[PDB]
Design a protein around this ligand. Structure first.
Ligand SMILES: [K+]
Ligand SMILES: [K+]
Ligand SMILES: [K+]
Ligand SMILES: [Mg+2]
Ligand SMILES: [Mg+2]
Ligand SMILES: [Mg+2]
Ligand SMILES: [Mg+2]
Ligand SMILES: [Mg+2]
Ligand SMILES: [Mg+2]
Ligand SMILES: [Mg+2]
Ligand SMILES: [Mg+2]
Ligand SMILES: [Mg+2]
Ligand SMILES: [Mg+2]
Ligand SMILES: [Mg+2]
Ligand SMILES: [Mg+2]
Ligand SMILES: [Mg+2]
Ligand SMILES: [Mg+2]
Ligand SMILES: [Mg+2]
Ligand SMILES: [Mg+2]
Ligand SMILES: [Mg+2]
Ligand SMILES: [Mg+2]
Ligand SMILES: [Mg+2]
Ligand SMILES: [Mg+2]
Ligand SMILES: [Mg+2]
Ligand SMILES: [Mg+2]
Ligand SMILES: [Mg+2]
Ligand code: NA
Ligand code: NA
Ligand code: NA
Ligand code: NA
Ligand code: NA
Ligand code: NA
Lengths: 77, 63, 95, 48, 103
RNA sequence: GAAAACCCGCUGUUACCCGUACCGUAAACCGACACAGGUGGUUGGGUUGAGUAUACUAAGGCGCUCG
RNA sequence: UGUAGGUAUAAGUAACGAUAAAGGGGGCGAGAACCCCCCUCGCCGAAAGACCAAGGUUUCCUGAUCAACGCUAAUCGGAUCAGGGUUAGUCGGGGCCUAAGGAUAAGCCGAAUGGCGAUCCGAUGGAAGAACCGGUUAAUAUUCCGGUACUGAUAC
RNA sequence: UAAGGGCAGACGGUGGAUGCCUAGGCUCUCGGAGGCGAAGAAGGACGUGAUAAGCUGCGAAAAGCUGCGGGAAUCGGCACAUACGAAUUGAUCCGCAGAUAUCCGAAUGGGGCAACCCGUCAGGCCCCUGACACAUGAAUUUUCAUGAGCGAACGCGGGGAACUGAAACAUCUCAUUACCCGUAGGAGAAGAAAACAAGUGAUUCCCUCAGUAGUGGCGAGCGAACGGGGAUUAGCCCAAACCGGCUUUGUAGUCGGGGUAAUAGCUUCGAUAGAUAUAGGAGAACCUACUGGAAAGUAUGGCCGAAGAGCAUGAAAGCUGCGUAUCCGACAUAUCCCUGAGUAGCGCGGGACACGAAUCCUGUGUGAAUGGCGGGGCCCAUCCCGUAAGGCUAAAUACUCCCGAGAGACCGAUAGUGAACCAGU
């Protein structure tokens, strides 16, 4: 379960395409990393496995809103 | 005994009579093995009697 | 209930002739010595001194049909040699 | 000369026995296929 | 299925070598649909002296039940039978030739 | 030039369970065979000898299933 | 060089599986080179004798049977059918312990199926709580019996 | 003179062809039903009979136990058996409802080489036995509920070849196939326009449009849609504005719950119970002669028919038997002011669309508007159509392990299933 916990992003499947149009299977990976966050509203520290897109959402709407949204959408677990 | 004579008995008397008939059946089986009886069907009759007795006891236990 | 039948054979007849307190039974394969002693005591109203047991696997046999052969087998059993107290006896002919 | 089959009951059961088959997803696949074919001998555990 | 004849019934043979002869029913083989009629269809069996002194034994062999018809109590003739509940709510066999209850 | 359990120091009355037959340098195991092959360990008398080599021979076992 | 079944030809031919070897007298039987008993001869004898383990699984003993099996015949058999035969407080194992390795916990990794990962499993090792002598069956014996002992729990 | 041989006929042997026969296959039709399992499954092990059990049934109550209904003389399963019993005070059997139901197996007290070894706590016996409880994981507040495993096809989803074709081969094809994996239901998926078009009006399926438009080393190939004709027909509900209740938080707010409000090409707030099925009851009508081992055959002469379907019977039967047409029948138990944001859009790399770079999707990086916004095959202007970033939804469609009833210008034992029988033996 390598998957972003905020957006639910997981790896995609695609092709390497050469100049002569040879097509080879490949995986597009998520820019995924583990990061620690200070939850102000609960005054504690959490560790989340998130993507850079998840970090953008967190920096856009706050950590509490992102966590509640992810839990509602099922990404959190 | 037949099924009506069995169902006429009380639970305690039925219990004592069942434990009696079980030992009688065991002795009859040993005797038949030693020397074949004139009527082997007595064994089958005793076996079915024991089954009927246990059925009635279960009916009373869960009724 | 575990006692199936007694053992009547030349070996058992000789053993009982030489001892008179020793008898043989064919019992259920999964009964232990204490269970055999209790069952024998309850069945015959005697005092049991010792029990010896051996387990016998059933013999493989051939069942013959019109077409040919089928491989089959007899049931497995356990032999119990029971020695009573001195002066006790069990009668197989009576009753 | 030494031939290929050198019997050992412990090795036979460890390699092809019922519990060895049940321990793996592909072993359970083998068991399901044999049941579907209707084999009387499911594994080497059934033999004697 | 209930058969049109039974043990103890008087029947007439209507087909075969014993055609035209009556007798009593001694046994019914339901699965094979045959019956033993007393005195009819005699066979000679070569019996070994095993016994328990052998010889040639004469005994009745079964007849197919579609070859047997109940004898009418009135006229003593083979007839087809029916069934009605005239006997106090119980089904009884009666002879279609006359109407009398078969007994 | 294993580990852990363990073990140290700090007068009656009873005795459960499974195996126990038979073959096993083989006619019974692995070799399609009553197959000149393969099969781990122990014991293995006397004379001769350095010897468990060699030759003969007790006990025991065999004369190898066509003449 | 097609397939199944059946039957030919080669042919009454190759061959009957170690060149350790047999001869005679009795017995039984319808039938005997081969079965049973006796005498003589020969071969092995660090084995071709006697045991344990693996493996086999009733082949063990007895009575009937000689169709098939036995590279011949057979009255014989590890063959067919039926009956019988394996007895443990002390022998062996298991119950206890851990090795390689395996399965896992907390955790880690990973489209899925899953892959890893210190307590448990796992003997080929460590503990086992503990005897011998003699006799006896057609077939079992440190197990049955007669002596002689010992060990562990349990009620005073 | 035929040792032997050749040819023909007759008669035998071997072998098992052929003919005739078969409920064992094959293909379907209609109607149901579409699961089983922690109340322990599928599938097994061991047992169980008067006598050894190979099948079948059953489970220490072990070819069986109890009750209600049906029925009326035999029954005690099969592999060419007897004995011995049961039964008109109604056996056996049939329908429905119950009782028992060892051990293994998801296996679940711990282990384990399946069908075994070893336990703990309470309770009843006397070293040793009989009845409990004792797994894990997500919900729930120790209790409770669910799950796990197996299994036909059909559905959805995650991964995903190659041989082959292109007369070599790499783009392309084979093919979003085989296969592996996950997960539903009686169906599933889809579905109510930010749609098609240049008037229609949600999905799904069928016939056409049409091998057309397109796409393509413009090769091999691939291949729509609009429209028309049918089957079927169905549309609804949240979020927000605003109004009140509670809780919490800041210092009247601001959140989060539950209540009202009302949801859009244009708005909105505010101002059934009888029947059916699962046992059953009745159910017409034939004589004489010939041939023959035996008539159902043939020849006469009769009868029934809402019954002249069929099977069996010593040869081919409307009137011999079971049946058939028709009518009757159930004690149960089942079934029927606001307007959706990391969005719309955009760059880079890819994918799915008939399409090999418009519409749709996104790994990476970015990023609006709120009458405004999106599409009409690339971009602009006009015109037209629609109103995304929330959800649900029957029918027409797909399938057959299973049950019931039917059918065939399908097979007939080297055929038809591998398997007509001891067969996945
Ligand atoms: K023992
Ligand atoms: K021995
Ligand atoms: K050739
Ligand atoms: Mg050899
Ligand atoms: Mg040595
Ligand atoms: Mg020496
Ligand atoms: Mg030497
Ligand atoms: Mg050739
Ligand atoms: Mg020659
Ligand atoms: Mg040769
Ligand atoms: Mg020669
Ligand atoms: Mg030797
Ligand atoms: Mg022998
Ligand atoms: Mg003999
Ligand atoms: Mg011979
Ligand atoms: Mg023998
Ligand atoms: Mg351990
Ligand atoms: Mg011996
Ligand atoms: Mg001639
Ligand atoms: Mg001929
Ligand atoms: Mg019980
Ligand atoms: Mg377990
Ligand atoms: Mg090519
Ligand atoms: Mg009629
Ligand atoms: Mg008829
Ligand atoms: Mg066939
Ligand atoms: Na040995
Ligand atoms: Na062994
Ligand atoms: Na001649
Ligand atoms: Na368990
Ligand atoms: Na009727
Ligand atoms: Na004929």
């Amino acid at each position: 379960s390598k998957i972003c916990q905020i957006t639910g992003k997981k790896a995609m499947v695609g092709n390497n395409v050469s100049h002569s149009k040879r097509r080879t299977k490949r995986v597009f990976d998520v820019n995924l990393f583990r990061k620690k966050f200070y939850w102000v509203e609960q005054d504690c520290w959490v560790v989340l496995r998130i993507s850079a897109a998840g970090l953008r959402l967190i920096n856009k709407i706050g950590l509490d809103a992102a966590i509640k949204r992810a839990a509602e959408k099922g990404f959190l677990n | 005994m037949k099924i009506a004579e069995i169902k006429e008995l009380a639970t305690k008397e039925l219990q004592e009579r069942l434990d009696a008939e079980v030992a009688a059946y065991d002795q009859m089986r040993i005797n038949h093995a030693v020397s074949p009886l004139d009527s082997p069907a007595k064994l089958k009759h005793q076996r079915r009697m024991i089954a009927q007795m246990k059925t009635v006891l279960r009916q009373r236990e869960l009724n | 209930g575990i006692i199936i039948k007694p053992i009547i054979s030349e070996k058992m007849t000789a053993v009982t002739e030489k001892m008179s307190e020793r008898y043989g039974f064919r019992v259920s394969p999964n009964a232990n010595k204490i269970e055999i002693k209790k069952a024998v005591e309850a069945m015959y109203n005697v005092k049991v001194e010792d029990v010896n047991t051996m387990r016998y696997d059933g013999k493989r046999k051939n069942r013959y049909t019109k077409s040919g052969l089928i491989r089959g087998k007899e049931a497995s059993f356990k032999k119990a040699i029971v020695t009573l107290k001195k002066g006790e006896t069990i009668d197989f002919f009576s009753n | 000369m030494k031939r290929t089959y050198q019997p050992s009951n412990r090795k036979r059961l460890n390699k092809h026995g019922f519990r060895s088959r049940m321990a793996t997803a592909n072993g359970r696949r083998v068991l399901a296929a044999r049941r579907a074919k209707g084999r009387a001998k499911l594994t080497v555990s059934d033999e004697f | 299925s209930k058969l049109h004849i039974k043990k103890g019934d008087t029947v007439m043979v209507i087909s075969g070598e014993d055609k035209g002869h009556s007798g009593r029913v001694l046994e019914v083989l339901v699965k094979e649909q045959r019956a033993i009629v007393e005195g009819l269809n005699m066979i000679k069996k070569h019996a070994k002296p095993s016994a328990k002194q052998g010889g040639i034994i004469s005994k009745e062999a079964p007849i197919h039940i579609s070859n047997l018809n109940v004898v009418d109590p009135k006229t003593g003739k083979a007839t087809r039978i029916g069934r009605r509940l005239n006997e106090n709510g119980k089904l009884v066999r009666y002879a279609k030739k006359s109407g009398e209850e078969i007994k």
